[PDB]
A paper describes a structure:
The infectious HPV16 has a T = 7 icosahedral capsid (55 to 60 nm in diameter) comprised of 72 L1 protein pentamers. The apical surface of each capsomer is comprised of the antigenic loops (BC, DE, EF, FG and HI loops from each L1 protein) that connect eight antiparallel beta strands (BIDG and CHEF). An extension of the L1 C-terminus, or C-terminal arm, links capsomers together and provides stability due to the formation of disulfide bonds between 175.CYS and 428.CYS from two neighboring L1 proteins. First generated from mice in 1996, H16.V5 (V5) and H16.U4 (U4) are two distinctive monoclonal antibodies reactive to surface conformational epitopes on the intact HPV16 VLP.
Here we present the near-atomic resolution structures of HPV-V5 and HPV-U4 complexes at 4.7 Å and 5.8 Å resolutions, respectively. Due to steric limitations, only four V5 Fabs were included in the asymmetric unit, which was comprised of five hexavalent L1 proteins and one pentavalent L1 protein. Previously, based on a poorer resolution map, the proposed model for V5 binding was in the heavy chain-outwards mode of binding. This mode was confirmed here using the new near-atomic model of V5 Fab. The epitope of V5 was distributed among BC, DE, EF, FG and HI loops contributed by two neighboring L1 proteins within one capsomer. All of the binding sites were exposed and located at the topmost apical surface of the capsomer. Upon measuring the density magnitude ratio (pentavalent Fab/hexavalent Fab = 40%), V5 was found to bind preferentially to the hexavalent L1 protein binding site. The residues of the V5 epitope were found here to be distributed differently in the pentavalent capsomer than the hexavalent capsomer due to the different L1 environments. However, stabilization induced by Fab binding was observed readily as the significantly improved resolution of the capsid, which indicated less flexibility of the surface loops was possible after an interaction with V5. Thus, the binding pattern of V5 suggests that HPV16 likely binds to the cell surface via pentavalent capsomer interactions to initiate an infection.
Numbering used by the authors:
A (entry chain M): 52 to 478
B (entry chain C), C (entry chain A): 1 to 220
D (entry chain B), E (entry chain D): 1 to 223
Write the structure that this text describes.
Amino acid sequence: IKKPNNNKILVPKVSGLQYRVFRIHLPDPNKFGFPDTSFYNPDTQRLVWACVGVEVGRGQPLGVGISGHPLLNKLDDTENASAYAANAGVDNRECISMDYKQTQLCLIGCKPPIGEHWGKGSPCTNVAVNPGDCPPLELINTVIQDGDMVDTGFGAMDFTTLQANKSEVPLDICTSICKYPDYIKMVSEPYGDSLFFYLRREQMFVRHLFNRAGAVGENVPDDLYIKGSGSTANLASSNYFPTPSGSMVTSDAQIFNKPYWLQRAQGHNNGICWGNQLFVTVVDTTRSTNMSLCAAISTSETTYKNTNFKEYLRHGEEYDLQFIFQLCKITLTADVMTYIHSMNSTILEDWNFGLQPPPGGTLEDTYRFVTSQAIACQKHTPPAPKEDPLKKYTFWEVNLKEKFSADLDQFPLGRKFLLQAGLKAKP
Amino acid sequence: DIVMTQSPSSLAMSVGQKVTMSCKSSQSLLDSRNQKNYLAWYQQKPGQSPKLLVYFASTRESGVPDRFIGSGSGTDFTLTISSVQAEDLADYFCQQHYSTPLTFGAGTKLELKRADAAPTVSIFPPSSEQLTSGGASVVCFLNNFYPKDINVKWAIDGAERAGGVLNSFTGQDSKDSTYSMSSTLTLTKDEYERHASYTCEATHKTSTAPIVKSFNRGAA
Amino acid sequence: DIVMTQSPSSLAMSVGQKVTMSCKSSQSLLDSRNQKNYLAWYQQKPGQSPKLLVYFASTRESGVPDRFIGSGSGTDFTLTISSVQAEDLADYFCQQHYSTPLTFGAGTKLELKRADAAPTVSIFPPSSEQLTSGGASVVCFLNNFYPKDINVKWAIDGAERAGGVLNSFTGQDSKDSTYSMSSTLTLTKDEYERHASYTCEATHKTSTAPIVKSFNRGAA
Amino acid sequence: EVKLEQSGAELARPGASVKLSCKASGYTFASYWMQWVKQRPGQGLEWIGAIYPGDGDTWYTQKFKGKATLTADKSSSTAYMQLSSLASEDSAVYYCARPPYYYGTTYYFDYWGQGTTLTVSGAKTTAPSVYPLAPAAGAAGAGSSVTLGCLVKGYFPEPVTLTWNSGSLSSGVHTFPAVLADLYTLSSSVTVTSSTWPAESITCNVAHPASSTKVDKKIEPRG
Amino acid sequence: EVKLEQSGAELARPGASVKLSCKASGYTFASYWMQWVKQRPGQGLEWIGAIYPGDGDTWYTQKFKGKATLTADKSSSTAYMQLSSLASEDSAVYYCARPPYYYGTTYYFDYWGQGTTLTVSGAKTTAPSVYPLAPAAGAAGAGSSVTLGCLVKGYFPEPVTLTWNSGSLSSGVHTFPAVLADLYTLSSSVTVTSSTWPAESITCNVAHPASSTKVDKKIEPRG
């Protein structure tokens, strides 16, 4: 929602099918003393947080929402037809809606979740592209941003570029690029620090069978059938697409409101969150319910009229986060320092070591020549490497910095952490 | 692969009259689900671009008064025509939209009006410039005659000439509606100054008597 | 972005007669699913508010007798009018409800009744107060003439005056149905007392003879 | 019930700004689309655009893109049209109403408003200028029926009025429509009796409320 | 709007190749099927085939299987017809247009193109040959109305034109249609007045733009 003349948003667009992205800061442990700090040297070493266990609270009453589009390319029912269809007019689009595939997932790690989608690249140049050609396809990884859309079962791609009609799908997805996680490339990471853990459940089934209506891109070669006549003189459009249909939802398949416990993950990180930083990304279809209310512009007249009532739509959203954490130290040697500095050197900035110490070791390869000039050859003066790199990438934010407490007992979640390990006397 | 039959070939008529050409073909343009009829109708005035008249059966195209209304049912069809004015004269076609490849009608040529004519025959024996060229060129002129029907025969000193006969024709004119058709018998000059008298007969239904037009070399 | 053609411009008529204006446009106001026709009809008597008459094709709005019944089919349409009385005279409009932005017809102006008139031409050479003001104001009067058709020309001492011509007109009156149109040629006084005779000719179809009205300075 | 107040009239300078209003009765003012239609004689009906007061969304045809602007307020329950940077051809009637759109209908129109007229550009008010006419070489009343006339010109702005002998004679009263010369001008005539003139009194009475100038001009013979 | 340019005319040798073009306006050139129809007098309408520029798929009727070939390019937005290895009966009008197929329709046709004519085979351009005729044994103008004529033959290629006394007399002007003798030939006549001839001047004027040959031939009595 935005002011009509302005570009400024009046109301933010939100629905369940938007992905969620949570970024969570932690205060530096090493700024942060202890009741008894004697057990380590803070000089020769450091302190770094670790994430043992995680919860996701969700409080709404469970129910399914939905979407549609007023204009949709459609021919007619393909399921049962007494007689052959009618002649194709101009713009037979109709108002029809459908339910999206029910889905649940969870994502955790220190590096942003990596996405992928279909999309258009540049055709190799032999044939000059004429309007109406089939644009070639390309597989593209990208960082995942908030507000992005789950698949509905139409697959990750850019409708905006690849779909000109702009009417071929219901609204919510028409604008953006629905995206989907690739477990492979992610888990293929050498450090695994993208994500160390995850869970997913989803299901779908067919409901209806329809036809696109539009200019035929290609006709099947005849030999795959036999010529018609009369009503069969002409071939109806070849296209079809299913209508995805959500199923019965249960309280059981809910993956939330229940604790988790991590020890070993497919990645070599064990719950280490570098740079005091941690990521969670979660998406649910189950709360999608859309309440609808009506306002009366005139309260007097006693005869019902469709004139008196405007209609609006707002959607509920409820999250909670509770994170266990563990505390850890690091010894320093060369091998250590080396091995880290390889992995991500930016990490070492926010610490001291004590710092001068690895401010680059590498002698240059000797690119050299004039140190002045306005006259002789071109030279470089670009360099800066963008120290808050991902600030380009917007997404939802929460600060915890202030909230830590030192006693599990006082919280609902924690005492379970005790119970799992027992030990009824709090250390 | 089907075949259409387009009849009648030609009809003379008068203003306001109701005339009906016929449509005939092998199979059925029509089976009933959508009750589709595949007949077409096209008007072509001579030399200009054809145009669409009526398809199916009951179609009425935009721009056509009821002077044209479709007719025919089942397989073979007709065209009803209500009241004809001068502009209605044209060369019609009726054809088929069904079962590729396409099939067409023969042709429909409307004939204008009034009644007959009297035949006018003359003869112009070959000028010497034609005999200078080395050939013997004998034509015959028949002008302002209606309808087209005529017969042509050539008797050389009594001996009938079979073959080598050439002809051409010109259609109606606005006033007369009658015709001008040209006849030609042309060979080398060797026979002309040899064979004396020649005979060219014209047989119109007007003047049922066998009107004959002859001539000789060196004489009229 | 389509275009509507509204014809004819004007029609004179008599009581009770059946008259039909035409509707013309590029594309189809009509396709058949709901068989929507997008033509509209509006009546405007001069100076008052317009009003709705008929939309679609076969609409009959509340309060309109069959004196107005829609007509037309396919693309370009017509209006049927049954029997006309005096109150039926007005300025009609027909337009479109389809394919934003909106498209309108040109205009429809009905013309009343009876037959012609005779031309009445006088001349009032400039009064001195006009030449006192410094200009030369030469008008001409034509009153009670029907229909509007007239031609105006100005010959200055025989030399034709091209440009600077001014005109205005008044429509019918109840009784006469005829007209009064004002013609004007006005320049500075410099030429008036210099150039002698001036000539103003009026050409109505009534009195096909080239009726001329002239005058001179200082003389009638 | 169905009612609109299409009010005002205006004359203004070039490049200036203008204002319009249309008001509601017997329905919800903000619940539908609304219209503005420019009425220019010889051209006339033209569809500017439309506006839906709910959010005040707009439609601007290629013609009026830019300069035309539309807003309204429902607490006022009155339409507005805001246009700026005027021009000569801008002068015309802006004659608008509200179509039913919803209302169990679609486009075209159920209604036409009051009407309002706008003229641009202006000058300062001036007084009439009246010179009557007669035939040359003197007029004693000769002929079948003698004719004379007096015209009103050099006046700005509109309107003016002329009456012969306090409207005592309708014969020949064929006052022709006004036009702007840089000062509005019209013409008028009267058909009198050859015998009664010069004898019977002939007087034309000017009436220009704009300049508030009224002049009674008697007509008598002259050379 | 709907428009086609069916252009050119050609005469060529046996066994040669030919070219045709039809161009688009007011729609998408490549979005439908297209047609080619051969127009041969006395036979006339015949449906060659069809082509759909989207991929350029083809239809070749048993008749034109082989020799006929069809392609087009949409950037040109112009139809093509490629035919090779010509023949005599190939000479005819190729007169084509585009049916609606899609368009919310099926076969038959909404339109007819400009038209184009092809003639095969040719020769080299030649000059007219004109021999007028008269009656035998001399003509002084005897009879009710004397008749004379002059014909145009021995000319290639088309066209030619004849006018009697600069078209001063339409009587008898019944120029008969041309035909190819291996040189195009036609005939013409004129009906003159028995009295005015030989007296009044009789002249026929040849006009053959192809050979660019113009000859004014006077007609006078002879034995």
